[PDB]
Design a protein around this ligand. Structure first.
Ligand SMILES: [Mg+2]
Ligand SMILES: [Zn+2]
Ligand SMILES: [Zn+2]
Lengths: 258, 59, 100, 115, 59, 99, 66, 28, 149, 32, 446, 179, 179, 49
């Protein structure tokens, strides 16, 4: 009447993505961990743009839209800052936000390429992905135009908007050989073999298994550049644990109140 | 804009991609729909039945 | 509902069926009135339905294919009369618009 | 014009309870747990964890309407085991399993770097 | 007493719409006629009029 | 459409030889026969596509079109002739004329 | 009109790759090799460099002053 | 010399020449 | 007791009009002592069966030895003895038609029990002597076990 | 230019590999 | 006060052809701005959810609100008097999903069943006994669907793919193909559900439910059916693609052989007509009988190709599943997609000679061959010849013109029909009269 | 002629040269009835059963029968004619960059799309219709299925995250006049 | 789309709720499968398949109507050389529970359009708005803040309903009361 | 007059909006938006209950 002891094994650890395997766990836990990877991951991003003079050809809102999608590294800052909604002050305080500034004006004859490098941040560690590969092109200016503005960044998660979606794409896959028959191939010979498939090239799919549970769930969390993949996994698990704890506390209070 | 290079068109707040061929009346793009009709100077022999004539040589 | 189990000998005398069908043919009325024209019109209108009721409810078929019991047959008569009463055309219904 | 904001999916509104218990009348020892401002993330894991417990006769959630943020979880256990303690045990041991998974993943990462 | 719709406002909603409008025809037959011979795609309209592009309303 | 001169011919069943016309039968058989023929024609043309329409509606139409003895037309020349009322005739058509 | 910042389907940053894609197509590389030389494995992100139209140039042709 | 087989590419060069010389709205 | 029937069968033919579905097949089995037909439909996927195999089919009205006539509901948490402990394939259905060769004068000699286990059919056709325990609208089980012989 | 030369080399390759063409999803009219 | 949840309104679509076009609905506010309504209610309104428009009126008196609630409501107004059959039926993906859900080879675990029961507004709260206890508790789709059916309903229906030569022979009450729907005490026993049992047809399961049980019971039945079948479709899934349109590479050979045989036959008929051997069929001239023979030959060839294509499909095919379910499609659609499109007739005849004694300049004069008069030999999967493409465009234009003139004429016909029998009603004297109190029928409908 | 035409643009070679050389010819609707038109040059002339063997002309390309809105339709012959017509009439309502100098125009009811991608499959006819330079749509990863049920009777289910990233996000203008 | 498959967005789900392939590729649009057979639009499927093979290869494909070298078999063979099913079907996962879908969904790139028929420009309501001058009845048109017309057909349908009280209210109380 | 303002009129408390599927609603329900609901009114009589 208790849970299980899952095991973890990393197959490839890089600075762009991680391929780990979780064994001895239920499918629901795996799928929830995936959906938390995509939606419920704290991360800093641009959410408040004050435009003072925009003489470019694009719309006034286009600049803000593009600035909202520029990733910001938050390896050790997202855990420190607090949600702006729960702040106990007025104006975007640096304790709960990060300020940005952009002032570019094409003076020379050639056209300018306003990139993310022009975003001069007040904080040293909260900068766009340019540390260590070209930079995210914001807009193109021509002689006579200008773009002056300043924006503030805050913490959010993908459930609110896609700007806070650190993972590019999670490759979730379990049971490479169709052993549990969760999908029925009309013509198994016509399908290619999964990357993680242990069967030989002769047989098309593994035989049926009545008493068999889904295990050995594969992951390919791919970081966009803001948060490290293992950092994404740790943050997501910590957030799920916090949500579970809050739910338990609320349930306990409701029971005692009755 | 008769045979004018794209440079001037861009400088005159216009594009080289605009097909043209449309009048501008009171700041509104007006186009003349090509009407079709029956070809002139040609003899037509119809057979209208809802009348007193068996055949009719319209021209 | 009554669990007839059409294998065992049922307890339903034919006279019960006959008298029940006759009483039901009396209960279902369309042209109210004892007047001979009224009775003639009532017989003419509710003619096909009575013929079908007699054809389905017999002394032989009820004892060979249906095997209903007395309680089952009484419930059947009640259900038939209630459904026919509900099936009557409600006065004040715009049948011209419905037909159009 | 009337598209709802983005914060109404997770943030509680003033007066709205995070969890409400409601006993069912059709069968004994059956309560419906109604959760507010949540999705399948917080209901599917609890459903499966309840399914693991043999004393839980019934376990399953639903979403009354996808646009509306609410889930109802119905739990029915044996008469000698209330569903409140079943829910509490499921949450507690799921938390323990998640913490252990965290610790194992972390040690695996720290060993993978130069090792 | 004269015709109607000969000069229309050119629909500048997309380049394809502008292209279609500038090369559009219109028959002088009365709107919503009981007959069905002129509306039917005739065999002679091969390579001259698009057999697919046409409205779907009364016209 | 002759009917009349056809039924008199020998070796012709004078009981089942219909005419498929509404106005013709009214000058040969009678108004009730016209009602029956119109009912049959309506049922034939409505059930040709496999659809089904309850007979009560067909009968109600047939009776309304054969209520005044003559075949009243559903157009403005048969319904406005009935002594219904000036306010009802103007609604359908011929407003100023009937008023 | 301009390169998006992220792929609609996936979300990978593709905004910082249009200029590099043009350069790689410029030198000798063709599209089928340039796309995987840049690091685009999924086919969903490959439309961003193939299907995108660069209309910002025509817009910049209408310089406001000078 | 005649162009057997290899005609799909040469089929559209004449089209390109025609659309370059005469515009789409050339009739108006 | 509640044993409505008990007899050894053996399979002689499997989907003789060709397999229609992918997890169910017809089992045109025959008896060994009572000489009765059988058109059982088993889940070939989870319980594969090949020709020539023998099994001990026992139609029972209840799974308890004492025969307490369970109401009918899934209650996994039950420590009471169950007859299914010595069977590899148990099903639950409701007989719906008992056809026989009755006539107007003399009683039937051969009946045919038609039972539907929620979709899987079976016709236990044979004499009218051992089918006395079958009545229309009644719950029954299957309780088969393949014989190793 | 590269697309043009690609088209030409595709055409010449298609002309070269004229061994057999047995394909199911294709047909063409043949009157008389 | 503003409109709140629970109020009664009258949702209506702009063309009100018949009585099943203005029914009351209960209010339920939702964040986004789009009118919403159950898909079953879409068939009466004839809406298509493709940018349609539906009005929404609101009464301003408790009298009128109660009157609308008691007379014009969705659950009350399920059966129409025009054809005494249900109007609201399962005619969408739910129909195909429930058809596949009620097959014999459907097995569910405790988790899946136990999740599906949550979407039940009439569950008694007791888990049914599984159809297969050992070696693992497995339910069956029919057993789960039995709990969906309310009350004790008894009805018999036949499935779409029911062989006629099955009732006469043995296996009448035990169908190998899982047909012959039999329901007893509101529990599904045999058969696979389709439009014949759940759709809008006389004697359907929903019709029997409405006749026996109350209107609210039928409403709950519909809601439970949709809420269970749609949710299970997540686990099942339905789709369509190229893989469902490809043949087995032998059916192509059979189709090509049949087409060549038909071409040879029509050429022989043309040769006989040229040399004056084809005698005129009774009642028709020489050209008329020649055309009739050619059309019959082409139709026989098309039917043979379609039958060959159908018999060569697999149970996993999606076109076949969706056709046998009857949700959307037909056998002729599959025939046109795979085997062959067919003849592109116009004005009830073949393609005429628009030019001087030839359809198009490509074909030569006096070319009465099939491909030269509209017979499309290819299929939508293998492309079309430009000539047959043009002829198919001609046919589509003919259809569009017919649709337009119908949409112009049927409105006037309906207007004249409604305006001639507007005051006819059934008085309390149990007789049908009109505004002038003239008796039309002593009893309604005789 | 093909070699001389392929080197056009660079020197001076154009369609007038082909017309003057005597290779092409303008046949009107009235004269098209007295010529043996041929569809393709190679297929319909090699040597087979003697059909006419007297072709006088030959069409350039069969697909050229299509008009403006129909040409952008990929694989039109693989679809039924009414749906081709619906797409063609509905193409004129597709939004996007309707003209490059849209910021200078002051027309009423002007729509512009942020990221008008180009079709991943382009017909050889739209190369001249100028569609690729001014497209009116975005290539989306479409999965034909019935996921939930909100897409059953001619409806779709879009990705909220995609729309957040700028999926089919457009703008709406409305000009005014007053003096 | 470019084939006549119109429709309106029913609901929008986040990325976490959308299904996904063996890798992180969530569909952007999900149309009804039932719309294909009745409408007979195999060209849409062919476009999706060719878009997939083009995306995998990395160059725009050809969709000329009449080409004699573009069938389904050759495209399928090309697609099979990239680790994808030759017919384009792929295995998805339930976005909610994470279980594989039994039916292999057909997912692939496809070119979609957007029309100007927004809901914000069509949504309208009224509560005793402005009244005309000639006949004291509500105005007409969304811009003028007018009411919908209760056409004669609606009157006929209500009379078939026998709801005379509702008809009276609708024609007098909420149209033009006057003494 | 007769067909324009007597047998068919223009009515207040009306609305006209696009439609979408929603199987989660019963056959007798309707998914109205918030703007139309707030714009609309229903005259209710005051009563101490
Ligand atoms: Mg529609
Ligand atoms: Zn602060
Ligand atoms: Zn992508």
């Amino acid at each position: 009447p208790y849970a299980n002891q899952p095991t973890v094994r990393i197959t490839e650890l890089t600075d762009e993505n991680v391929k780990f395997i979780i064994e001895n766990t239920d499918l629901a836990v795996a799928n929830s961990i995936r959906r938390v990877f995509i939606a419920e991951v704290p991360i800093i991003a641009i959410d408040w743009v004050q435009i003072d003079a925009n003489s470019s050809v694009l719309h006034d809102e286009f600049i803000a839209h593009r600035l909202g999608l520029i990733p910001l590294t938050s390896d050790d800052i997202v855990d420190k800052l607090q949600y702006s909604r729960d702040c106990t002050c007025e104006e975007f305080c640096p304790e709960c936000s990060v300020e940005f500034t952009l002032d570019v004006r094409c003076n020379e004859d050639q056209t300018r390429h306003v990139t993310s490098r022009d975003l001069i941040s007040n904080s040293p560690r909260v900068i766009p992905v340019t540390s260590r590969q070209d930079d995210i092109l914001i807009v193109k200016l021509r002689k006579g135009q200008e773009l002056r503005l300043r924006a503030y960044a805050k913490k959010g998660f993908g459930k609110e908007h896609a700007k806070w979606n650190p993972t590019a794409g999670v490759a979730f896959e379990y049971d490479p050989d169709n052993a549990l028959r969760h999908t029925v191939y009309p013509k198994p010979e016509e399908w290619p073999k999964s990357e993680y498939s242990e069967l030989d090239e002769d047989e098309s799919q593994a035989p049926y298994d009545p008493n068999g549970k889904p295990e050995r769930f594969y992951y390919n969390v791919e970081s966009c550049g803001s948060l490290r993949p293992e950092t994404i996994v740790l943050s997501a698990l910590s957030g799920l644990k916090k949500k579970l704890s809050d739910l338990q506390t609320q349930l306990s209070h409701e029971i005692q109140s009755d | 804009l008769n045979g004018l290079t794209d440079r001037d068109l861009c400088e005159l707040n216009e594009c080289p991609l605009d097909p043209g061929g449309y009048f501008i009346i009171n700041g509104s793009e007006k186009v003349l729909i090509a009407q079709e009709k029956m070809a002139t100077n040609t003899v037509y022999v119809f057979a209208k039945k809802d009348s007193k004539y068996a055949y009719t040589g319209e021209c | 509902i009554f669990h007839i189990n059409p294998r065992l000998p049922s307890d339903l005398h034919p006279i019960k069926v006959v008298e029940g069908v006759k009483e039901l043919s009396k209960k279902l009325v369309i042209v109210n009135g004892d007047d001979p024209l009224s009775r003639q019109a009532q017989e003419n209108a509710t003619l096909l339905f009575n013929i079908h009721l007699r054809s389905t409810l017999c002394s032989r078929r009820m004892a060979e294919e249906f095997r209903l019991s007395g309680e089952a047959f009484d419930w059947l008569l009640g259900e038939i009369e209630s459904k026919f009463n509900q099936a009557i055309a409600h006065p004040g219904e715009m049948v011209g618009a419905l037909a159009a | 014009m009337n598209a709802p904001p983005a914060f109404e999916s997770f943030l509680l509104f003033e007066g709205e309870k995070k969890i409400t218990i409601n006993k069912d009348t059709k069968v004994p020892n059956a309560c419906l747990f109604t959760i507010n401002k949540e999705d399948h993330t917080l209901g599917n894991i609890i459903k499966s964890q309840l399914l693991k417990d043999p004393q839980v006769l019934f376990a399953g959630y639903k979403v009354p309407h996808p646009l509306e943020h609410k889930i109802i979880i119905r739990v029915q256990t044996t008469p000698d085991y209330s569903p409140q303690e079943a829910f509490t045990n499921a949450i507690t041991d799921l938390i323990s399993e998640l913490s252990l998974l965290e610790e194992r993943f972390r040690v695996a990462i720290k060993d993978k770097q130069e090792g | 007493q004269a015709r109607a719709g000969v000069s229309q406002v050119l629909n500048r909603l997309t380049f394809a719409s502008t292209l279609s409008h500038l090369r559009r025809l219109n028959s002088p037959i009365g709107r919503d006629g009981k007959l069905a011979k002129p509306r039917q795609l005739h065999n002679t309209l091969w390579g001259m009029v698009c057999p697919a592009e046409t409205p779907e309303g009364h016209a | 459409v002759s009917l009349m001169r056809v039924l008199s011919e020998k070796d012709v069943d004078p009981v089942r030889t219909t005419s498929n016309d509404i106005v013709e039968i009214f000058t040969v058989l009678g108004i009730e026969a016209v009602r029956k023929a119109l009912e049959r024609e309506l049922y034939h043309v409505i059930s040709f596509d496999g659809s089904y329409v309850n007979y009560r509606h067909l009968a109600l139409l047939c009776d309304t079109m054969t209520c005044r003895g003559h075949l009243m037309a559903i157009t403005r020349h048969g319904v406005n002739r009935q002594d219904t009322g000036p306010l009802m005739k103007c609604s359908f058509e011929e407003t100023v004329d009937v008023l | 009109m301009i390169i998006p910042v992220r792929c609609f389907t996936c979300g990978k940053i593709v905004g910082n790759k249009w200029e590099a894609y043009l350069g790689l197509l410029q030198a000798e590389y063709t599209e089928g090799d340039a796309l995987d030389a840049l690091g685009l494995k999924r086919y969903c992100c490959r439309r961003m460099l193939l299907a995108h139209v660069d209309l910002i140039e025509k817009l910049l042709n209408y310089a406001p002053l000078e | 010399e005649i162009t057997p087989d290899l005609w799909q590419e040469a089929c559209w060069i004449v089209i390109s020449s025609y659309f370059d010389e005469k515009g789409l709205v050339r009739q108006q | 007791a509640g044993i409505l029937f008990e007899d050894i069968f053996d399979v002689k033919d499997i989907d003789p009009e060709g397999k229609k579905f992918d997890r169910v097949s017809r089992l045109h089995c025959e008896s060994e002592s009572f000489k009765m037909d059988l058109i059982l439909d088993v889940n070939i996927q989870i319980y594969p069966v090949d020709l020539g195999d023998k099994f001990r089919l026992v139609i029972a009205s209840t799974l308890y030895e004492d025969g307490t006539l369970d109401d009918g509901e899934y209650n996994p948490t039950d420590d009471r003895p169950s007859r299914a402990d010595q069977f590899e394939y148990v099903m639950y259905g409701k007989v719906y038609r008992i056809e026989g060769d009755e006539t107007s004068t003399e009683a039937a000699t051969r009946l045919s029990a038609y039972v539907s286990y929620g979709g899987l059919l079976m016709r236990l056709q044979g004499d009218a002597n051992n089918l006395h325990g079958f009545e229309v609208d009644s719950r029954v089980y299957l309780l088969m076990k393949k014989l190793a012989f | 230019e590269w697309n043009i030369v690609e088209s030409e080399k595709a055409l010449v390759a298609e002309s070269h590999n004229m061994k057999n063409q047995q394909m199911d999803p294709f047909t063409r009219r043949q009157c008389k | 006060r503003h409109m709140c949840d629970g109020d009664i309104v009258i949702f209506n679509r702009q063309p009100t052809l018949h009585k099943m076009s203005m029914m009351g609905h209960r209010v339920r506010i939702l964040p986004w701005s789009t009118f919403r309504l159950n898909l079953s209610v879409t068939t009466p309104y004839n809406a298509d959810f493709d940018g349609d428009e539906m009005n929404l009126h609101l009464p301003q008196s408790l009298e009128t609100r109660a009157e609308i609630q008691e007379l014009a409501m969705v659950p009350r107004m399920i059966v129409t008097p025009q054809s005494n059959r249900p109007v609201m039926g399962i005619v969408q993906d739910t129909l195909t999903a429930v058809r596949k859900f009620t097959k014999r080879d459907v097995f569910l675990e405790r988790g899946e069943v136990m999740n599906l029961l949550m979407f039940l507004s009439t569950w008694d709260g007791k888990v049914p006994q599984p159809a297969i206890l050992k070696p693992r508790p497995l339910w069956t789709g029919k057993q789960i669907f039995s709990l969906i059916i309310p009350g004790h309903i008894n009805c018999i229906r036949t499935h779409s793919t029911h062989p006629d030569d099955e009732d006469s022979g043995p296996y009448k009450h035990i169908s190998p193909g899982d047909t012959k729907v039999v329901v007893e005490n509101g529990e599904l026993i045999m058969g696979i559900l389709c439009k014949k049992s759940l759709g809008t047809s006389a004697g359907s399961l929903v019709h029997i439910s409405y006749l026996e049980m109350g209107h609210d019971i039928t409403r709950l039945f519909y809601s439970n059916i949709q809420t269970v079948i749609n949710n299970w479709l997540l686990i099942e899934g339905h789709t369509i693609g190229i893989g469902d349109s490809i043949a087995d590479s032998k059916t192509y050979q059979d189709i090509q052989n049949t087409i060549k045989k038909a071409k040879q036959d029509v050429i022989e008929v043309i040769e006989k007509a040229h040399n004056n051997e084809l005698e005129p069929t009774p009642g028709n001239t020489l050209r008329q009988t020649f055309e009739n023979q050619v059309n019959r030959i082409l139709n026989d060839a098309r039917d043979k190709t379609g039958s060959s294509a159908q018999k060569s499909l697999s149970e996993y095919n999606n076109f076949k599943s969706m056709v046998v379910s009857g949700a959307k499609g037909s056998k002729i659609n599959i025939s046109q997609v795979i085997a062959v499109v067919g003849q592109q007739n116009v004005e009830g005849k073949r393609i005429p000679f628009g030019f001087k004694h030839r359809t198009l300049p490509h074909f030569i004069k006096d070319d009465y061959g099939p491909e030269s008069r509209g017979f499309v030999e290819n299929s939508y999967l293998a492309g079309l010849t430009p000539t047959e493409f043009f002829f198919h465009a001609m046919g589509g234009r003919e259809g569009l013109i017919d649709t337009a003139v119908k949409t112009a004429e049927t409105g006037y016909i309906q207007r004249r029909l409604i305006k001639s029998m507007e005051s006819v009603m059934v008085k309390y004297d149990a007789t049908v009269r009109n505004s002038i109190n003239q008796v039309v029928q002593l009893r309604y409908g005789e | 002629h093909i070699d001389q035409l392929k080197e056009r643009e660079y020197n001076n070679y154009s369609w007038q040269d082909l017309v003057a050389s005597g290779v092409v010819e303008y046949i009107d609707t009235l004269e098209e009835e007295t010529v043996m038109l041929a569809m393709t040059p190679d297929d319909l002339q090699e040597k087979e059963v003697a059909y006419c063997s007297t072709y006088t002309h030959c069409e350039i390309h069969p697909s050229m029968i299509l008009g403006v809105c129909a040409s952008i339709i990929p694989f039109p012959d693989h679809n039924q004619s009414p749906r081709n017509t619906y797409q063609s009439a509905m193409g004129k309502q597709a939004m996007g960059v309707y003209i490059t100098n849209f910021h200078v125009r002051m027309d009423t009811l002007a729509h512009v799309l942020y990221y008008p991608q180009k079709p991943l499959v382009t017909t050889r006819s739209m190369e001249y219709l100028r569609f690729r330079e001014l497209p009116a749509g975005i290539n989306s990863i479409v999965a034909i299925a019935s996921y939930t049920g909100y897409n059953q009777e001619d409806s779709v289910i879009m990705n909220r995250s995609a729309v957040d990233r700028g999926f089919f996000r457009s703008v709406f203008y409305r000009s005014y006049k007053e003096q | 789309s470019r084939h006549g498959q119109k429709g309106t967005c029913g609901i929008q789900y986040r990325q976490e709720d959308m299904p996904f392939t063996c890798e992180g590729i969530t569909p952007d649009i999900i149309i009804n499968p039932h719309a294909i057979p009745s409408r007979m639009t195999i060209g849409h499927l062919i476009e999706c398949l060719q878009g997939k093979v083009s995306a995998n290869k990395g160059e725009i494909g050809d969709a000329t109507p009449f080409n004699d070298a573009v069938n389904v078999q050759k495209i399928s063979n090309l697609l099979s050389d990239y680790g994808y099913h030759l017919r384009g079907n792929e295995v998805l996962y339930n976005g909610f529970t994470g279980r594989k879908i039994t039916s292999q969904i057909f997912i692939g790139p496809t070119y979609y359009q957007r029309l100007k028929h927004m809901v914000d420009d069509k949504i309208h309501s009224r509560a005793r708005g402005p009244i005309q001058i000639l006949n004291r009845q509500p105005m007409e048109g969304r811009s003028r803040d007018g009411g919908l017309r209760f056409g004669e057909m609606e009157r006929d349908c209500q009379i078939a309903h026998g709801a005379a009280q509702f008809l009276r209210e609708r024609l007098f109380e909420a149209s033009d009361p006057y003494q | 007059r007769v067909r324009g303002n007597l047998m068919g009129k223009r009515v207040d408390f009306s609305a006209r909006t696009v439609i979408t599927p929603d199987p989660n609603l019963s056959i007798d329900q309707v998914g109205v938006p918030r703007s139309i609901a707030a714009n609309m009114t229903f005259a209710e009589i005051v009563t101490p209950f």
